[PDB]
Design a protein around this ligand. Structure first.
Ligand SMILES: CC(=O)N1CCN(c2cccc(-c3cc(-c4ccnn4C4CCOCC4)c4c(N)ncnn34)c2)CC1
Lengths: 911, 163
C-alpha cells in the first residue's frame, strides 16, 4: 500500500495517530501533523513547527534526529512508524554526523558502546580525534592542496606530436579551440588560452589537469590521442574550488583453569576434550597440553588445571592461547569449535582472572590440525547462541605486571668457514641445523644480509625472552628495507608489534599510486591484527585522509565485509574514524549507498519477476519501478562507486536491462549532457572478490609492462564488491563476446574500414599477447569464446573469472586460439613477420613479470587473509613460482616459455 | 586399504570419492543454513533492541503526559472545563493502548528468536555429527589415492576414478 499509519508523540504528552504516504517527506508530514494537532488538546502550548524536529528509532535500533526534512519516510525507514517531536536546538552538528555514520557503515555506533570494552572506547577516542584534527588541518590548507586531496592526478605510468585541444569557461557556452605540444605542461596550456581569452578540469568529470607534468602523461589526454577525439576542458581558478571546499622475575610455569563449557551441541554417545597450545604466529611456544574426557552435554564441567612447558617470564608480547573443543568417541575426531586469546592485553598488562571466550565453529579442511592459531583473536559476536569456554588465568603478584618497555627490552638485548655456510643457506624452509647457524651469525645477517631480516626473525626462539631481546635490539637498529621486503613482514608469521612498525616505517615511502595497487592486500592484513589500535590502521587512515580516491576505496574495501562477524567490529571502528575526518566524501558515499540499496530491491524484484513472465514483460515492469520519484532520484546524479571521478548523471531507463545469467545482473545506463555514455552492472548473488583480485593483478601487470615502455592495450574495467555477494562491474562500451561475434575478421572490417583495419589488428595482437601471458601466469582456465570479448577498436579482453590458480589444482597450459592467430596473421596462412612480432610481445611480457615475481608472491601471500578457497595455502602461491619459473634463470625460463609457446601453437592446430 | 588388487582398489577409490563428494555437498548446504540462521538471529536480536528503544520512548511520553497534565487538569477544573480534562485523559488512554500493541509485537519476536535459536543449535548438532564422517571419507579416499600412486597407477586412470 502507498499509505502507512504513523504514531505521533507531541511534547505536551499528546498522542496523535493518522495515515500518511510512504513517499512523503518529513517537512510535508510535519505540516499534516500541525493541521490535525490543532483539533487535539493542548495545541496552544506548542511552539511553531520549525521549533521542533522528528525523532525515530531507525533499522539499527538507534535514536535518530531527522534534520533533513527533505528525506521521504521510505528513505528514512524507521523501525516502527513512530515519530516524536523534540527540541530542535542542542549541538545538532554531532547528532547528525553520529546518526549518518551508523546508516553508512551498516552498524549502529551504540553496538560499540554496548560492548563495555576499554580497548574499543580508547580506539574511538584516539582515532576519531586524530581524524577530526586532520580534517580541520585540511580545511586550513590552500586551494592547491585541497585540489590534490579531492581530485588527485590520474597520470599514465615517448614522441612529441601536435594535439588539437578545446577550452571553455564556467557558465559560458563559447569555446576557443587551439593546438599545443604533446609534451607541454598545463601551466603553458592555460597561459596560451589566457592570451587567447582577451583577443584545469575535464568537463563532465571530476578530473583536473594541474602540476609539473606534460599534457600527454595524463590519462584523459592519453585516451584522447589513441581514440582520436579532441580534449574538451573548462578553465577554472580559486573562486569555484573554494565553493566546492565549503616481570622477567616470574619463573613459574604458565597455568590455565579450564572450568566450564556452554551451549555445546554434539552426539551424546561421545566424550569432550579441550586441546590448548601456546602460539606466536604459526610457531608453537610449547607442547599441546590436553584436557580429560567428559560426557557430551550442553554445559560440560572440567575445573582442571593445564600447565604448559614455558615459564611465565619467557612468554612473548604477542603470545596466543589457542583453544579447540573436540568430540572424541570415548577410548575420526570431530572439531566442534575453536578460540584464541591474547595473554597480554592492549595496555601491555598480562590478563588475570576469569575470561569467557565465545567460541567460533571449526571447518573441516585439508590440514585438519587440532588448533587454529591464525584465526581471529576476538570473541564470537553471536553471544546469544554460540558455544563458549569458561577459563580463568591465575594471579601471579600483588600488583599487575606489564610486558617490559622498549628501554628495559633493548637493555637485556645489548668465523669465515661458517661465513660461506650462511651465504649458501640465505640463497624457502630453513631446518633446525640451519636455524641454529643463522641465529649465531645474527650480527652478520644485519651487516651483510639486511634483506634476509624475515628469514632471521623466523629462526629466533620466541619462547625464550633472552633470544627475543637480542632480536628486537637488532631490529631497533636494522637498516630501512625496500617496499617489497616490508610487504613480506605484514604476513601472520611475523606477529611482533615491533616488526609491524618496522614494516610500516618502510611502507611510508609509497606514492599514492603504488599504495593503491596494494590497498586490497593491506586491508586484508588487518584480519591478522590482534589489537584494534595498530600502526597499519593509523597508516591506512592517515593515507585515506590525505587522498580522497584512496579514502573512497578504503571505505568500500571495509564496507563490503561489514557482514563478516570476525571483522565487523574492527572494520566498523575504522569506518567511523574515516567518516569523522571525511564529512565531504561522507555525503558522496551516502548518495552511492542509497542507489545501491535501491538496485538490490530492483534486482530482487527482477529475480522473482523473471520466474513468472518473459524477458520484455519483466523489462517494462522493471522500468516502471525505476520511474518512481524515490527510485529515479536515488539512482540519478551520483559519483560512480567504481571510479569516483566519473559522474553518473541521467539514468537511461529505456537503455536499462538485465542479463539472462546465473544471478540475473542489472544493466544500468547513464547519459551526460555536460560530458560519454557511461554504464554500470549491478550484480547480486555471487562473490565478486576473486574477479577484483584477478583484475587488480592484470592492472599491476599492465602498469609493470607500461613502466618498461610496453603498452599491450589492456582493458582493466572496474569491479567493486559493495557488500555480501553484492557488487558493481564497469560497462565496456562498443564491445561483444567472441561467441556472439561468430554468429571475426569481418567484425573488425565492419568496425575499422580503410587504414583503420591495420590499427585494430595491432590492438588485437597487443591485447592478445598480454591476456595470453596474464591468463597463463594466474592459471585462469576455462577460457572460451563466451568469456572472451572484443572491442570495436580491436582490443581483446577476458571477462568473468571464477577459477584461479588452476583450481577448475592442475597446471593450466599457455593457450593460443586458431581464430586469434588467424586475425594476428591478417588472414594469411603464413605471416612470419607478424607472428614473430606477436611471439616477441608474449616473451617480453612474461620476462617483465618474472622481474617482479616476488611482488606477486608477497601480494598473493598477504591475500591468503581474504579466505578465498582458491587462495588458502602455500601450494596456491607455489603455482606462481612455477608459472613464473622463479626457481630458474631468465634464459632457462625463456626457453621453457618458448617450448610451451610452440606447443600452444601446435595444439591450436589440433582443434 | 582393505583390498590388494589395482582395479578392485580403483573401484573403491571411485565409490569413496562419490561418498565424499556427496557428504561434502550435504555439509556445505548445512553451513549455508548455519550462516543464514546466524545472520537472521542477529537481525531479530537488533529488532528486539529496537522494540525496547520504541517502548522506552513511549514510556518517556507517559512520564511527560503525567507531569505536564498536572498543571492543566488543575487549571481547566476551576474554569468548569471538565470537557478539556476528559479530552486530555482519553488521549492518554489512547497512548497507553498503543503501548500494549507494541509490547505484544515485541513478545511475538521473542517467540521467533527462541524458536530460531533452537533451530540454530540443532543445525550445529547436525553439522557436528557429519564432521567425523566427512573427515573419515577424506582420509580414506586419500589413502587409496596414495596406494595406487605407490603401485604406479597412471594419472589418466586415477582421474577416471576420481572424476
Ligand atoms: C546493450 C545490451 O543491453 N546488451 C549487449 C551486450 N550484452 C552482453 C552480452 C554478453 C556479455 C556482456 C558483458 C559481460 C561483461 C562482464 C565483464 C565482467 N563481468 N561481466 C558480467 C557481469 C555480470 O555477470 C555476467 C558477466 C561485460 C562488460 N564489462 N561490459 C560489457 N558487456 N559485458 C554483455 C548484454 C545485452
Amino acid at each position: 500500500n502507498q499509505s502507512v499509519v504513523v504514531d505521533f508523540l507531541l511534547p505536551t504528552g499528546v498522542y496523535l495517530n493518522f495515515p500518511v504516504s510512504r513517499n512523503a517527506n518529513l517537512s510535508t508530514i510535519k505540516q499534516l501533523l500541525w493541521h490535525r494537532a490543532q483539533y487535539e488538546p493542548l495545541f496552544h502550548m506548542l511552539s511553531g513547527p520549525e521549533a521542533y524536529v522528528f525523532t525515530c528509532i531507525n533499522q539499527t535500533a538507534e535514536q535518530q534526529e531527522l534534520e533533513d526534512e527533505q528525506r521521504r519516510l521510505c528513505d528514512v525507514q524507521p523501525f516502527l512508524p513512530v515519530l516524536r517531536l523534540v527540541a530542535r536546538e542542542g549541538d545538532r552538528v554531532k547528532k547528525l554526523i553520529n546518526s549518518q555514520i551508523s546508516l553508512l557503515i551498516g552498524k549502529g555506533l551504540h553496538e560499540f558502546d554496548s560492548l563495555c570494552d576499554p580497548e574499543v572506547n580508547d580506539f574511538r577516542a584516539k582515532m576519531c580525534q586524530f581524524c577530526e584534527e586532520a580534517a580541520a588541518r585540511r580545511q586550513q590548507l590552500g586551494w592547491e592542496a585541497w585540489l590534490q586531496y579531492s581530485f588527485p592526478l590520474q597520470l599514465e605510468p615517448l614522441p612529441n606530436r601536435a594535439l588539437l585541444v578545446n577550452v571553455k569557461f564556467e557558465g559560458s557556452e563559447e569555446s576557443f579551440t587551439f593546438q599545443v605540444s604533446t609534451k607541454d605542461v598545463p601551466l603553458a596550456l592555460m597561459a596560451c588560452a589566457l592570451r587567447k581569452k582577451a583577443t584545469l578540469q575535464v568537463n563532465g568529470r571530476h578530473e583536473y589537469l594541474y602540476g609539473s607534468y606534460p599534457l600527454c602523461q595524463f590519462q584523459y589526454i592519453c585516451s584522447c590521442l589513441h581514440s582520436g577525439l579532441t580534449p574538451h576542458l573548462t578553465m577554472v581558478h580559486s573562486s569555484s574550488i573554494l565553493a566546492m571546499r565549503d616481570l622477567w622475575s616470574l619463573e613459574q610455569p604458565f597455568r590455565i583453569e579450564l572450568i566450564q563449557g556452554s551451549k555445546v551441541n554434539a552426539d551424546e554417545r561421545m566424550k569432550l576434550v579441550v586441546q590448548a597450545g601456546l602460539f606466536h604466529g604459526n610457531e608453537m611456544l610449547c607442547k599441546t597440553v590436553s584436557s580429560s574426557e567428559v560426557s557430551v552435554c550442553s554445559e560440560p564441567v572440567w575445573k582442571q588445571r593445564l600447565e604448559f612447558d614455558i615459564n611465565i617470564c619467557d612468554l612473548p608480547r604477542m603470545a596466543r592461547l589457542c583453544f579447540a573443543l573436540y568430540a572424541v568417541i570415548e577410548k575420526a575426531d570431530c572439531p566442534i569449535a575453536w578460540a584464541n586469546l591474547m595473554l597480554f592485553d592492549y595496555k601491555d598488562q598480562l590478563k588475570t582472572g576469569e575470561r569467557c571466550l565465545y567460541m567460533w565453529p571449526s571447518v573441516p579442511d585439508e590440514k585438519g590440525e587440532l588448533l587454529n592459531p591464525t584465526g581471529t583473536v576476538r570473541s564470537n559476536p553471536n553471544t546469544d547462541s554460540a558455544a563458549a569456554l569458561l577459563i580463568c588465568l591465575p594471579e601471579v603478584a600483588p600488583h599487575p605486571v606489564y610486558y617490559p618497555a622498549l628501554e628495559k627490552i633493548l637493555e637485556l638485548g645489548r668465523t669465515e668457514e661458517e661465513q660461506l655456510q650462511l651465504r649458501e643457506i640465505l640463497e624457502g624452509e630453513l631446518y633446525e641445523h640451519e636455524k641454529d647457524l643463522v641465529w649465531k651469525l645474527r650480527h652478520e645477517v644485519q651487516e651483510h644480509f639486511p634483506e634476509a631480516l624475515a628469514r632471521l626473525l623466523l629462526v629466533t626462539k620466541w619462547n625464550k625472552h633472552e633470544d627475543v631481546a637480542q632480536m628486537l635490539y637488532l631490529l631497533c637498529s636494522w637498516p630501512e628495507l625496500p617496499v617489497l621486503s616490508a610487504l613480506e613482514l605484514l604476513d601472520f608469521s611475523f606477529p611482533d608489534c615491533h616488526v609491524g612498525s618496522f614494516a610500516i616505517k618502510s611502507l611510508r615511502k609509497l606514492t599514492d599510486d603504488e599504495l593503491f595497487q596494494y590497498l586490497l592486500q593491506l586491508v586484508q592484513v588487518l584480519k591478522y591484527e590482534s589489537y584494534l589500535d595498530c600502526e597499519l590502521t593509523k597508516f591506512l587512515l592517515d593515507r585515506a585522509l590525505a587522498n580522497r580516491k584512496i579514502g573512497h576505496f578504503l571505505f568500500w574495501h571495509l564496507r563490503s565485509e561489514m557482514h563478516v562477524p570476525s571483522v565487523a567490529l574492527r572494520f566498523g571502528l575504522i569506518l567511523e574514524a574515516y567518516c569523522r575526518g571525511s564529512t565531504h566524501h561522507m555525503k558522496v558515499l551516502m548518495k552511492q549507498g542509497e542507489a545501491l540499496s535501491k538496485l538490490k530491491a530492483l534486482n530482487d524484484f527482477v529475480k522473482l519477476s523473471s520466474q513468472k513472465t518473459p524477458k520484455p514483460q519483466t523489462k517494462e515492469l522493471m522500468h516502471l519501478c525505476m520511474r518512481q520519484e524515490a527510485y529515479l532520484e536515488a539512482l540519478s546524479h551520483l559519483q560512480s562507486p567504481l571510479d569516483p571521478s566519473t559522474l553518473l548523471a541521467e539514468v537511461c531507463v529505456e537503455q536499462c536491462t538485465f542479463m539472462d545469467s546465473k544471478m540475473k545482473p542489472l544493466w544500468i545506463m547513464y547519459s551526460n549532457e555536460e560530458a560519454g555514455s557511461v554504464g554500470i552492472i549491478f550484480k547480486n548473488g555471487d562473490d565478486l572478490r576473486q574477479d577484483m583480485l584477478t583484475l587488480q593483478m592484470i592492472q599491476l601487470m599492465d602498469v609493470l609492462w607500461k613502466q618498461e615502455g610496453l603498452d599491450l592495450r589492456m582493458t582493466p574495467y572496474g569491479c567493486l564488491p559493495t557488500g555480501d555477494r553484492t557488487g558493481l562491474i564497469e560497462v565496456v562500451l562498443r564491445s561483444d563476446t567472441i561467441a556472439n561475434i561468430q554468429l571475426l575478421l569481418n567484425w573488425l572490417k565492419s568496425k575499422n574500414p580503410g587504414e583503420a583495419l591495420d590499427r585494430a589488428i595491432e590492438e588485437f595482437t597487443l591485447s592478445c599477447a598480454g591476456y595470453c601471458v596474464a591468463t597463463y601466469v594466474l592459471g585462469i582456465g576455462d577460457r572460451h569464446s563466451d568469456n572472451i570479448m572484443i572491442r570495436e577498436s580491436g582490443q581483446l579482453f577476458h571477462i568473468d573469472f571464477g577459477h584461479f590458480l588452476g583450481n577448475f589444482r592442475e597446471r593450466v597450459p599457455f593457450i593460443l586460439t586458431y581464430d586469434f592467430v588467424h586475425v594476428i596473421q591478417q588472414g594469411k596462412t603464413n605471416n612470419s613477420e607478424k607472428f614473430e612480432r606477436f611471439r616477441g610481445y608474449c616473451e617480453r611480457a612474461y620476462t617483465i613479470l618474472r622481474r617482479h615475481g616476488l611482488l606477486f608472491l608477497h601480494l598473493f601471500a598477504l591475500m591468503r587473509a581474504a579466505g578465498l578457497p582458491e587462495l588458502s595455502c602455500s601450494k596456491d602461491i607455489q603455482y606462481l613460482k612455477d608459472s613464473l619459473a622463479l626457481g630458474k634463470t631468465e634464459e632457462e625460463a625463456l626457453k621453457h616459455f618458448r617450448v610451451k609457446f610452440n606447443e600452444a601453437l601446435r595444439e591450436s592446430w589440433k582443434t | 586399504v582393505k583390498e590388494d588388487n589395482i582395479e578392485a582398489v580403483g573401484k573403491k577409490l571411485h565409490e569413496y570419492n562419490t561418498q565424499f563428494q556427496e557428504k561434502s555437498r550435504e555439509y556445505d548446504r548445512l553451513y549455508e543454513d548455519y550462516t543464514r540462521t546466524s545472520q537472521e538471529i542477529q537481525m531479530k536480536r537488533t529488532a528486539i533492541e529496537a522494540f525496547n528503544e520504541t517502548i522506552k520512548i513511549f514510556e518517556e511520553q507517559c512520564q511527560t503526559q503525567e507531569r505536564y497534565s498536572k498543571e492543566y487538569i488543575e487549571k481547566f477544573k476551576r474554569e468548569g472545563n471538565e470537557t478539556e480534562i476528559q479530552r486530555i485523559m482519553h488521549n492518554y488512554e489512547k497512548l497507553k493502548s498503543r503501548i500494549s500493541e507494541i509490547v505484544d509485537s515485541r513478545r511475538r519476536l521473542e517467540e521467533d528468536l527462541k524458536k530460531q535459536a533452537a533451530e540454530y543449535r540443532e543445525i550445529d548438532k547436525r553439522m557436528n555429527s557429519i564432521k567425523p564422517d566427512l573427515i573419515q571419507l577424506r582420509k580414506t579416499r586419500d589413502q587409496y589415492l596414495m596406494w595406487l600412486t605407490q603401485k604406479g597407477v597412471r594419472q589418466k586412470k586415477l582421474n577416471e576414478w576420481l572424476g
